[PDB]
Amino acid sequence: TEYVGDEACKTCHSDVHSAWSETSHGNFIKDVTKDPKALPGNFEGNYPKMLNFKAEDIQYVLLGKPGALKVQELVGKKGTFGVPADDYPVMWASWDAGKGEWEIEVEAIGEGTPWLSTCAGCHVTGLTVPTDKNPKAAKAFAGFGITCEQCHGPGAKHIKNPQGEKMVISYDAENCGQCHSRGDSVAKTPDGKPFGYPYNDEGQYVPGKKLADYYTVVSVEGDKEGKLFWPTKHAKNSHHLQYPEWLMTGHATALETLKGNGHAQDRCLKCHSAEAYLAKEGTTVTMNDAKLGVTCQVCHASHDPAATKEAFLRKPKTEICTQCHNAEGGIVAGKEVHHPHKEMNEGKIGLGFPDSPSVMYKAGVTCVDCHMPKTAGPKASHLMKVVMPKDGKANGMPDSCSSCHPGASQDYLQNVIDTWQNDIKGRLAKVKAKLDAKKAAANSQAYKEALTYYSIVAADGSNGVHNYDLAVKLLTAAEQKLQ
Amino acid sequence: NTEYVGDEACKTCHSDVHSAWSETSHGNFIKDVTKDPKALPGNFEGNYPKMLNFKAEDIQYVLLGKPGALKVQELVGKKGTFGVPADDYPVMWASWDAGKGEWEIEVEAIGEGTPWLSTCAGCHVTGLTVPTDKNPKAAKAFAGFGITCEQCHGPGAKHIKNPQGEKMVISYDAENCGQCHSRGDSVAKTPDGKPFGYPYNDEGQYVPGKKLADYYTVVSVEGDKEGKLFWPTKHAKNSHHLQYPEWLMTGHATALETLKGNGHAQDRCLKCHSAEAYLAKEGTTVTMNDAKLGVTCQVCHASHDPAATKEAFLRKPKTEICTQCHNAEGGIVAGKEVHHPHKEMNEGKIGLGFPDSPSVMYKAGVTCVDCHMPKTAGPKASHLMKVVMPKDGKANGMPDSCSSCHPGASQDYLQNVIDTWQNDIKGRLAKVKAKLDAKKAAANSQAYKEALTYYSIVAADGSNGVHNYDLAVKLLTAAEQKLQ
Ligand code: HEC
Ligand code: HEC
Ligand code: HEC
Ligand code: HEC
Ligand code: HEC
Ligand code: HEC
Ligand code: HEC
Ligand code: HEC
Ligand code: HEC
Ligand code: HEC
Ligand code: HEC
Ligand code: HEC
Ligand code: HEC
Ligand code: HEC
Ligand SMILES: [Cl-]
Ligand SMILES: [Mg+2]
Numbered sequence A: 001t002e003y004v005g006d007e008a009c010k011t012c013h014s015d016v017h018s019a020w021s022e023t024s025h026g027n028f029i030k031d032v033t034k035d036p037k038a039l040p041g042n043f044e045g046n047y048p049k050m051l052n053f054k055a056e057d058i059q060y061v062l063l064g065k066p067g068a069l070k071v072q073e074l075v076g077k078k079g080t081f082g083v084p085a086d087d088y089p090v091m092w093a094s095w096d097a098g099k100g101e102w103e104i105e106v107e108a109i110g111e112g113t114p115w116l117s118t119c120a121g122c123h124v125t126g127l128t129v130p131t132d133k134n135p136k137a138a139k140a141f142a143g144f145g146i147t148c149e150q151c152h153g154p155g156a157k158h159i160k161n162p163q164g165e166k167m168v169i170s171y172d173a174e175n176c177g178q179c180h181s182r183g184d185s186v187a188k189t190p191d192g193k194p195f196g197y198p199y200n201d202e203g204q205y206v207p208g209k210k211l212a213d214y215y216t217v218v219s220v221e222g223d224k225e226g227k228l229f230w231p232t233k234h235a236k237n238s239h240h241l242q243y244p245e246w247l248m249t250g251h252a253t254a255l256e257t258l259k260g261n262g263h264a265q266d267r268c269l270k271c272h273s274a275e276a277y278l279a280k281e282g283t284t285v286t287m288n289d290a291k292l293g294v295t296c297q298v299c300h301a302s303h304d305p306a307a308t309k310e311a312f313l314r315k316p317k318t319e320i321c322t323q324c325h326n327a328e329g330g331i332v333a334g335k336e337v338h339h340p341h342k343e344m345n346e347g348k349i350g351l352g353f354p355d356s357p358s359v360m361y362k363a364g365v366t367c368v369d370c371h372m373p374k375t376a377g378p379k380a381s382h383l384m385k386v387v388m389p390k391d392g393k394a395n396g397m398p399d400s401c402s403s404c405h406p407g408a409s410q411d412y413l414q415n416v417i418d419t420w421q422n423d424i425k426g427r428l429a430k431v432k433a434k435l436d437a438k439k440a441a442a443n444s445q446a447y448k449e450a451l452t453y454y455s456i457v458a459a460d461g462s463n464g465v466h467n468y469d470l471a472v473k474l475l476t477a478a479e480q481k482l483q
Numbered sequence B: 001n002t003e004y005v006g007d008e009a010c011k012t013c014h015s016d017v018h019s020a021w022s023e024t025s026h027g028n029f030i031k032d033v034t035k036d037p038k039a040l041p042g043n044f045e046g047n048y049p050k051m052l053n054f055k056a057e058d059i060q061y062v063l064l065g066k067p068g069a070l071k072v073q074e075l076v077g078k079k080g081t082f083g084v085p086a087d088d089y090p091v092m093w094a095s096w097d098a099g100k101g102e103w104e105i106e107v108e109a110i111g112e113g114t115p116w117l118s119t120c121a122g123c124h125v126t127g128l129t130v131p132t133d134k135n136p137k138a139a140k141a142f143a144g145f146g147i148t149c150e151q152c153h154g155p156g157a158k159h160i161k162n163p164q165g166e167k168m169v170i171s172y173d174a175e176n177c178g179q180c181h182s183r184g185d186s187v188a189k190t191p192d193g194k195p196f197g198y199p200y201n202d203e204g205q206y207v208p209g210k211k212l213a214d215y216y217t218v219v220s221v222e223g224d225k226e227g228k229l230f231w232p233t234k235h236a237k238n239s240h241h242l243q244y245p246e247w248l249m250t251g252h253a254t255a256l257e258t259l260k261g262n263g264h265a266q267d268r269c270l271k272c273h274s275a276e277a278y279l280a281k282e283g284t285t286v287t288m289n290d291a292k293l294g295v296t297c298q299v300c301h302a303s304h305d306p307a308a309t310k311e312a313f314l315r316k317p318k319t320e321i322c323t324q325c326h327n328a329e330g331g332i333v334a335g336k337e338v339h340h341p342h343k344e345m346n347e348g349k350i351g352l353g354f355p356d357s358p359s360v361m362y363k364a365g366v367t368c369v370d371c372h373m374p375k376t377a378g379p380k381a382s383h384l385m386k387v388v389m390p391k392d393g394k395a396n397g398m399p400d401s402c403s404s405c406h407p408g409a410s411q412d413y414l415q416n417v418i419d420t421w422q423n424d425i426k427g428r429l430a431k432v433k434a435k436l437d438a439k440k441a442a443a444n445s446q447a448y449k450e451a452l453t454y455y456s457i458v459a460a461d462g463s464n465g466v467h468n469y470d471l472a473v474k475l476l477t478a479a480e481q482k483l484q
Helices: A014-022 A047-051 A148-152 A156-160 A242-247 A254-260 A266-272 A341-346 A367-371 A389-395 A410-437 A445-460 A468-481 B015-023 B048-052 B149-153 B157-161 B243-248 B255-261 B267-273 B342-347 B368-372 B390-396 B411-438 B446-461 B469-482
Strands: A029-031 A058-062 A071-076 A093-096 A101-104 A183-185 A215-217 B030-032 B059-063 B074-077 B094-096 B103-105 B184-186 B216-218
Touching: A047 A101, A215 A242, A254 A266, A341 A445, A389 A410, A410 A445, A410 A468, A445 A468, B048 B103, B074 B094, B216 B243, B255 B267, B342 B446, B390 B411, B411 B446, B411 B469, B446 B469
Parallel strands: none
Antiparallel strands: A029 A058, A058 A071, A071 A093, A093 A101, A183 A215, B030 B059, B059 B074, B094 B103, B184 B216
């Protein structure tokens, strides 16, 4: 094997190894025979009678340190509970650390799921398993995930000659999509079915290669029966659909959108491209060099002590969206505004208006809460799209409003949105028609101010939901200026 | 040996009552699952017995045979099994939620059933005999399944023979329900000298028409030294049946006494202040001299009436159950002081030329029950009738009146909303009261009369604006404009 494991990298990359160690990636697998303290959950007294197994039966825990994610699975000792002798049983009871309680799949009591043939392509390095090309192959792996070489490729040649043998740094979403997806392998099992993890002739996905050569990811189109995505396209299945969701978002096409536009320059790339966003202090990135949109790596830091403990965000949840979704350089009377989302919600637009933050802004609600609704169990949707309460009702799905407002009905909450939006859509139609009609007076100061007031509300794109009273105040002031 | 004849005996003469009682969860509380296998709830198929550590064949009864408002179903195993005495039954260690649709397992009691008759069944069956320290010899037995007619009306043997000559008990007294809907110690004791958890004396169980205190010392805030049963606010903490101890601490329990202490008391008043008057059938008169009881359980809950709500047997819908009494309907006139305009304040219908201004929460479907009966003890609505302020929610780690509907807001945020509203309204009320006292000489004027009434709506409402903040402000603003 060419995989040397994480300990090899601590000497030369001391800080990165330390920061990686604190991440839940870095604590994903614990050997509980070597480290009994790491085995979570209560096995004391009668618990074994309920569980139908005991502490001594367990070899590993999956999710060794909880972060944002909290449910911990157990892998039993090799060969036990009905699995082949060269594989391990994933157990039928998981521990919810955050809730502090066992969760038992009753139908699988006694019958462990084979770990390596079902799961471990997303969990370990250098995995070999029997395929229909190699039915004979022995089941084995090199090292525990989620580790350096899974995101940077094998380290053997690099540890010998660091300057001469380069590792892969990928800002590509595929670097994360190799695990943060569902899909079928190109390879097949001895029985002719696909694996649930990336796998081809050559084995697992390797950073620097094309994911499609190893893995066909699930999609809204491929999910004929609506088992994985809701009709809104948000993830339904709790299990890891961030990448398939992300592919449907503007973030994925952020750089392409910039290229298609006539006014594109190098200034723009900071908000539209990962390479530019993640360029270190002196470096230049140019329209020709940039290839990628707003990928996972823009929002998530794989090993940085400044990142948040849960979900490794590069900035706090309050800033993670506003960093790009602002109009900071461009709120001036006479100029049209682009995406003033930060400013609209917090109510800081200048132009002589005092600060009028929305009620929800003052109550601590932020972009993430409405635009990343928990549509798949406890997981925040990466579609970035609001689930309207009507669709919450129509599909029996969680929505952007009802989790914070369980006292209100979905029809009540939808009526709030429609009342706000119909009012603001109307005023926007009037003021736009008045601005077009009086185009000849464009040079006047009154018109310039009305154009900008109108543009804040329009370009915001929420039709008032972000800050209803400010939207009204602005479009009222726009019409006063227009006579 | 027993005077208890069971419910079937009453069906012939009281056909409608028996039918209505049959649909109540009282009437379906115990099912024999050997005689009726369909009645056994929960999943025993496949591997479930390996998890549960028992099987369907081990079960004799189900407690809570029909779910209503209450949803968790318990199982009683076959006689003598799982570690209990040979003359008693094991209450099992796994309950079925049904509302959730899932098992709930007390892991510590796997293998060890709790003895049903000596621990529980005084609240569940008629004619219960168990060994006491007076009669250690007595054999454990019972007459009939609860929750049945004779538990609320007394034994039926003599009455079925001679209906007109041998009267049954109808009680509007809260004790009629408090005999089960409480926690406390029996006056009787076990062979070991401990009290039973159900009413029991020398003569056995509580009988309707007798005084509960002769059989049972109910728990109280004062008796609960260690705060295991009540929160510091006095609301129930323990999920298990504390409606009666809660009810005793409320004005509803003293509603008739309050009326008697007042000088202007008349027979008109009794409809809102007394059970006998409230429940008086078409024709009957109730007078200050006849009425003995306040606003008891029986005012709000109907024991067998097809017009009641299916869950909790409410006599009126949750939207009307409080407003029926908490209104000022006959008394909003300029110049007169208003009394308890709670309905009117919340819905914003006060007349006096003002258009309708219902509060935001009124328009959003919030009602008295939601704020005043917060679920402080698991899924059970508190009968203390008192709001739990979010500060006390935070300070004690208890559910509060606001956070369940507003989980997005912090408890400090929600308390600040209340204090902002209340401090504003308390201030305006202090100004307008001082101005009304000061200009007492101008009392005959139309302006003053209207300001007195506006002030009185907001003051007598007693919420200091929480019921409808904007209306409170509008009224006290209008009161001060009139006082210029
Ligand atoms: C350079 C000077 C720039 C050009 C040319 C463009 N941008 Fe941006 N951008 C940003 C956000 C958050 C959005 C989404 C806004 C929304 O959906 O409301 C955009 C969008 C665009 C678009 C249109 C795509 C669409 O309709 O959604 C174009 C053509 C475009 N951008 C070109 C963020 C930022 C940003 C953050 C600080 C900067 C500096 C720029 N964009 C700069 C440019
Ligand atoms: C497998 C080979 C993975 C790769 C490559 C990446 N991730 Fe991952 N991730 C993986 C697992 C099995 C888990 C669950 C264990 C856990 O840490 O909770 C995760 C978890 C995350 C999380 C959640 C972190 C938390 O606070 O709980 C995030 C935010 C995350 N992963 C992001 C992420 C990014 C941005 C990646 C590439 C740049 C990436 N992951 C790669 C498995 C694998
Ligand atoms: C910002 C523009 C983001 C991009 C691009 C991606 N993610 Fe993300 N992620 C983001 C936030 C703000 C959060 C927190 C959500 C919350 O309400 O807490 C997350 C969370 C995750 C998680 C944890 C899942 C959960 O607990 O809800 C994972 C595993 C994750 N993100 C992975 C991930 C991957 C693989 C991405 C590229 C496909 C990706 N994210 C993009 C913000 C952003
Ligand atoms: C820059 C580094 C960004 C961060 C951080 C976030 N967003 Fe973004 N977003 C950005 C661009 C350039 C675009 C336009 C992309 C395009 O090709 O048109 C977007 C777009 C969105 C949208 C529009 C809907 C869509 O196209 O999918 C939404 C709703 C959105 N962004 C939300 C959003 C949220 C909630 C964020 C924080 C977690 C966030 N974005 C971060 C640039 C950047
Ligand atoms: C709910 C309390 C929200 C908060 C907080 C924020 N947003 Fe929002 N947003 C919300 C709604 C209901 C809508 C309207 C969607 C519709 O289909 O009518 C929006 C709209 C946007 C958009 C434009 C949507 C689009 O054209 O695709 C964007 C880009 C957007 N929102 C981003 C955004 C950001 C960055 C936020 C915080 C700074 C933010 N929103 C807050 C609901 C809510
Ligand atoms: C928490 C994560 C929330 C989400 C998501 C949404 N709302 Fe909200 N909202 C929240 C708080 C804490 C508050 C303040 C206290 C309270 O609960 O009232 C609000 C406030 C509102 C209001 C009143 C606004 C006003 O102008 O007076 C409305 C009408 C409202 N919220 C509606 C609403 C809708 C329609 C949402 C999704 C589209 C939504 N909220 C999201 C907390 C949170
Ligand atoms: C308490 C849990 C009761 C059970 C069980 C049953 N009854 Fe009842 N009954 C009870 C009360 C408190 C009252 C008076 C107040 C009220 O809600 O009506 C009654 C009234 C009756 C009457 C009076 C005649 C009438 O107007 O309907 C009868 C004849 C009567 N109850 C009979 C009865 C029978 C036959 C029951 C079981 C088969 C039964 N009741 C159950 C309290 C409770
Ligand atoms: C006739 C064959 C009866 C049987 C059997 C039972 N009841 Fe009865 N009951 C009967 C009559 C004729 C009357 C009074 C006159 C009338 O208007 O019907 C009653 C009255 C009651 C009452 C009211 C209190 C009283 O006046 O005694 C109650 C609470 C009552 N009955 C209850 C009751 C119960 C619980 C029975 C069986 C367990 C039962 N009755 C049998 C006629 C007959
Ligand atoms: C025991 C001898 C009881 C007496 C007397 C009364 N109640 Fe009761 N009640 C009892 C039990 C064991 C249960 C639980 C089973 C069930 O019905 O859920 C109840 C339940 C209620 C309920 C809830 C009904 C529901 O929908 O779930 C109510 C509202 C109720 N009980 C009221 C009540 C009243 C008003 C009583 C006297 C007038 C009364 N009960 C007597 C046990 C016993
Ligand atoms: C009459 C048939 C009533 C019904 C139905 C309800 N209430 Fe009541 N309430 C009533 C009276 C006569 C009184 C005054 C009692 C006294 O002795 O002075 C009350 C009092 C209250 C109070 C005040 C606080 C207290 O003393 O406990 C509250 C908060 C209260 N009532 C609330 C309330 C609610 C929430 C109701 C429906 C669930 C309800 N009441 C019904 C008369 C009547
Ligand atoms: C319902 C339609 C009622 C009628 C008729 C009468 N009263 Fe009442 N009363 C009612 C309620 C709901 C309450 C409690 C509300 C509250 O303000 O807390 C009361 C309270 C009283 C009180 C106590 C005053 C107080 O502490 O606030 C008294 C002294 C009182 N009631 C007397 C009374 C008299 C004399 C009546 C007729 C002449 C009368 N009430 C009728 C409900 C109703
Ligand atoms: C009105 C003035 C009431 C009086 C007096 C009593 N109860 Fe009540 N109860 C009332 C309401 C409106 C409700 C529904 C609460 C909800 O939000 O769902 C109840 C409920 C109960 C229940 C069911 C418990 C639950 O589901 O939360 C029981 C068992 C019950 N009530 C019993 C009970 C007893 C024994 C009473 C007198 C001692 C009593 N209640 C008085 C309204 C009123
Ligand atoms: C919350 C959304 C509430 C609703 C709905 C209703 N009430 Fe209320 N009430 C509420 C508060 C926060 C307060 C103030 C309590 C304090 O200590 O400051 C009140 C007050 C009352 C009172 C006075 C109680 C007392 O002084 O002891 C009464 C009598 C009362 N409320 C009754 C009541 C009724 C009948 C309701 C519906 C018709 C109602 N309230 C709604 C909170 C809320
Ligand atoms: C549901 C059973 C609720 C309870 C109990 C309480 N509130 Fe509420 N509230 C609820 C809804 C559905 C709404 C409208 C939509 C929304 O969630 O905002 C509200 C509204 C409010 C508001 C804003 C109203 C305004 O004046 O503009 C506030 C400030 C508010 N609620 C506070 C509040 C407090 C302090 C509570 C207990 C003392 C409380 N609410 C109870 C739903 C429910
Ligand atoms: Cl109301
Ligand atoms: Mg609200």
